[PDB]
């Protein structure tokens, strides 16, 4: 369970997709995530939090997270909601 664990992080993004789309503010977790993610989709997601809604922006933000191959990106998730202090931090099963 070395890389397999991070392999989990990816499938996990897909797994708590609904809990993400609902509780995630894509304008917030993006701050922690953008440290691993690229501005192009980061800024797009920020546009859709507006145009479509936070949920849709989050939905867009998930698919984008999956494209990143950092170590930190799925941790930016829990890290984000610890920083915002949101519920999602608890149910998300990432490092620490």
Which pair of tokens denotes residue 8?
Answer: 């989990």
Q: Is 7 exposed, middle or buried (CB count within 10 Å of its CB: 0-12, 13-18, 19+)?
A: exposed
Residue 96 lies in domain: 1-96
Q: Per-residue b/e over 35-73, b at no fewer than 16 CB within 10 Å?
A: ebbeeebbeebbebbeeeebbbbbbbbbebbeebeeebb
| CA distances to 25, 45, 54, 73 from 50, in Å | 11, 9, 7, 23
> Which structural technique was applied?
NMR
Domains identified in the chain, total number: 1
Q: Is 33 exposed, middle or buried (CB count within 10 Å of its CB: 0-12, 13-18, 19+)?
A: buried
> Can you tell me which residue has the tokens 């708590």?
16
Within the chain, strands assigned E span none
Give yes or no for a contact between 65 and 53, defined as CB atoms under 8 angstroms apart.
no
Which pair of tokens denotes residue 51?
Answer: 């145009």
> Can you tell me which residue has the tokens 């990816």?
10
> Can you tell me which residue has the tokens 């995630």?
24
Q: What is the CATH number of the domain that holds 22?
A: 1.10.533.10
Q: Rounded to an integer, what distance in angstroms lies between the CA atom of residue 96 and that of residue 89?
A: 10
């Amino acid at each position: 369970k070395k890389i397999e664990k991070l392999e989990e992080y990816r499938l996990l993004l897909k797994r708590l997709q609904p809990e993400f789309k609902t509780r995630i503010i894509p304008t917030d977790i993006i701050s922690d995530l953008s440290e691993c993610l690229i501005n192009q989709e980061c800024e797009e997601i920020l546009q859709i939090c507006s145009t479509k809604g936070m949920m849709a922006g989050a939905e867009k933000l998930v698919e984008c997270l999956l494209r990143s191959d950092k170590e930190n990106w799925p941790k930016e998730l829990k890290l984000a909601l610890e920083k915002e202090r949101n519920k999602f931090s608890e149910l998300w099963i990432v490092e620490k």
